Amino acid sequence: YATLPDLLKPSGAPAELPKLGFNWKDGCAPVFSPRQMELHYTKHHKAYVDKLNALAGTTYDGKSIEEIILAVANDAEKKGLFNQAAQHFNHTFYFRCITPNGKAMPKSFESAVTAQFGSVEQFKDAFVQAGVNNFGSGWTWLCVDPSNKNQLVIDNTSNAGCPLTKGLRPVLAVDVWEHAYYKDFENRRPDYLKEIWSVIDWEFVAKMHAQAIK
Template sequence: MENNHKNNRRDFIKTTGKAGIAASLAFTVLPSIITKAAKNNYFDFAAGTPFQQQPLPYQYTALEPVIDAMTMEIHYSKHAAAYAKNLADACTAEKVDTSATKLEDVLMNISKYTPKMRNNGGGHYNHELFWQSMAAPNSTGLQGKLKDSIEKSFNSIEAFKTQFTEAGKTRFGSGWAWLVLTNDKKLVIGSTPNQDNPLMDISDLKGFPVLGLDVWEHAYYLKYQNRRPDYINAWWNVVNWDFVSKRFEAAI
C-alpha cells in the first residue's frame, strides 16, 4: 500500500511537471467596484490585477501543515505560471493591449474572446487572488465590517463556513468556490467550473469575488488525495482574513 502511494505521488508530480501547461446590464457597477478596490491598494496593485504572474507573498513552506511545500511549489511555479504564460500568448494573438486594458475588463467581456483567453485569463486572475487570500496559520481572525456582513447574510460565521464548504465539496470536477459581493451589495456563496469566475459575463454566478477557493485536484492531491472535504476544512486555518476584509471594505 505504501509503495503504491509513493508511485501515485511520483506519477502525479511527473504529470503536473509536464502540465505546466460586452458586459451585461448586471455588470454596470462592477467597474466602479474594481476601481475603488484598486485605489485602496489591497492587492498592492495600482490598477487591477496585472497580466503577469506576481511573486508569491510567502515561502512555499509558509502554509504548512495545511498546504505542503511541494504542492505550493508545483501549484505556483507550474500550474499558475502556465496560466500566466498562456494568457500572454492569448493577448498577443487577440491583440489585447495589456498596457491600456485591465484584466478585469477582459473577464467581464469574456464572451467576446476565445476559450484560450477565458481559460487562462480566468486561471491567472483566480490564482493571483488565491495566493493573496492565504497566510500562515494563526493569522488575524475574521472581524470588522466583513464579519458583521457575513453574520447578517448567513446568520453566523459557522453557517457561512458550512455553506461555503458545501459549495466547494459539491463542485463537480474541477472549479472554484466563491464568496461574492453582488451588484446590490449582498453577499452570496456559489461555485464556478474550471477557471471561470464571477466577473465573467458568461458565469451563472455574477458579482465581485471577495474570497475564492481552488478545488482543482492539483491544489490538494499530494497531501489529501481524494479527500477534498479534509482539504477545505483545513484551508480555513490559512485564510488571510485581514486581506479579505480589506478587499471587501474597498468594494463596498
C-alpha cells in the same frame, strides 16, 4: 469595478507571475506542504501566465487582466485566451486569500458574515458544502452582489469561470481543481475545505469586502 486594479497586462512586456505574500518553499503552514505550493504556483499558475502572454500578443497591452476577461467572456473565437486570463486572476486572488497561520476576521467583516449567514460557523458549513459538491474542476467563492443590495453570496464556478462575468465582486476564493489539494489531501476534498480555514487571510478578504460595497 476592478477587484485587482494592479493586476495588468503590461505594454510591451509579458504579464509576470505575481509574487506571493509568503515564501512557497516553506509551504503555507499548517495546511500545505512546500511541494503542494510549489506545484500550484510555479507549475499551474505559471503555465496560465505563460500561455496568457503567448495568446494575448500585444492586443491587450495596458489592460487589466479583469478587463481582458470581460472583453472575451462570451467570445468563442478566444475561449483559450479567456481560460488563461480568468485562471491567472483566479489563482492570483486565491493565493492572496491564504497566508501561513491565517489572519483573524476583523470585527467589521465578521459582523457582515454574521448578519447574512446567521453565524460564521453557518457560513463556513455552507461554503464547505458548496465546495464539496462543485462537480469537476472549479472554484467556490464568497462574493458581494451589487445587483442585490450588496448581499454576500456563495457562488460556484466551473473550470476558469470567474464571477465578474456575471457582475459579482469576489471577496474569497477557494480552488477546487483537484491539483489544489491532491498532493496534500489526495481525494479528500472535504478535509481540504475544512482545514483551509486556518490559513485564510481574513484581512485581505475584509479589504476586498470593504472596497466591494463602498
